[PDB]
Design a protein around this motif. Structure first.
Motif, PDB file in Angstrom:
ATOM      1  N   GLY A  56       0.777  -1.218   0.000  1.00  0.00           N
ATOM      2  CA  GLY A  56       0.000   0.000   0.000  1.00  0.00           C
ATOM      3  C   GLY A  56       0.812   1.272   0.000  1.00  0.00           C
ATOM      4  O   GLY A  56       0.257   2.343   0.254  1.00  0.00           O
ATOM      5  N   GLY A  57       2.109   1.190  -0.275  1.00  0.00           N
ATOM      6  CA  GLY A  57       2.984   2.336  -0.241  1.00  0.00           C
ATOM      7  C   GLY A  57       3.717   2.511  -1.556  1.00  0.00           C
ATOM      8  O   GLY A  57       3.230   2.146  -2.625  1.00  0.00           O
ATOM      9  N   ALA A  96       9.206   6.143  -7.256  1.00  0.00           N
ATOM     10  CA  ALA A  96       9.112   7.257  -6.319  1.00  0.00           C
ATOM     11  C   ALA A  96      10.061   8.345  -6.799  1.00  0.00           C
ATOM     12  O   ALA A  96      11.272   8.123  -6.885  1.00  0.00           O
ATOM     13  CB  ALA A  96       9.463   6.813  -4.902  1.00  0.00           C
ATOM     14  N   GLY A  97       9.513   9.511  -7.114  1.00  0.00           N
ATOM     15  CA  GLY A  97      10.288  10.590  -7.693  1.00  0.00           C
ATOM     16  C   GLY A  97      11.025  11.419  -6.666  1.00  0.00           C
ATOM     17  O   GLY A  97      11.238  11.002  -5.521  1.00  0.00           O
ATOM     18  N   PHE A  98      11.419  12.622  -7.084  1.00  0.00           N
ATOM     19  CA  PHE A  98      12.174  13.519  -6.221  1.00  0.00           C
ATOM     20  C   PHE A  98      11.287  14.234  -5.213  1.00  0.00           C
ATOM     21  O   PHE A  98      11.729  14.508  -4.093  1.00  0.00           O
ATOM     22  CB  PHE A  98      12.916  14.549  -7.071  1.00  0.00           C
TER      23      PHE A  98
END
Length: 50
Positions: free
Chosen positions: A39-40, A46-48
């Motif tokens: 769920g994460g 995952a960007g900056f």
DNA sequence: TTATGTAATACGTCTGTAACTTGTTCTTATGTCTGTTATGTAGTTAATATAATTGAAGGATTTTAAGA
């Protein structure tokens, strides 16, 4: 039901081996917040900004 | 001088050791046959019942085929 609870407590990404080098490692591990896990976020998605 | 008789010496040699070899005889390990038990396979059951399923998740860019 036993399978679900032991899944969560034995094979979850957030159920980690306790860091026990010193008391500070214990306290920091217990007070750690992870954006990963179910769920994460994933680390290649995952960007900056986050 | 020469027979004689002892003595060194070299060569056969009779016998004691040992090698080569077989008989055979006994013992044992193995291969095989047979009998019994466990395992593996298979078939059947007749109130009635009639469109899954479970997630999963803030990606960022390129290039390349289908659709119009």
């Amino acid at each position: 039901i036993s399978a679900a609870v032991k899944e969560f407590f034995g094979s979850s990404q957030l159920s980690q081996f306790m860091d026990q080098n010193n008391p500070l490692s214990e306290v920091t591990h217990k007070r750690r917040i992870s954006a990963l896990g179910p769920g994460g976020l994933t680390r290649e998605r995952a960007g900056f900004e986050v």
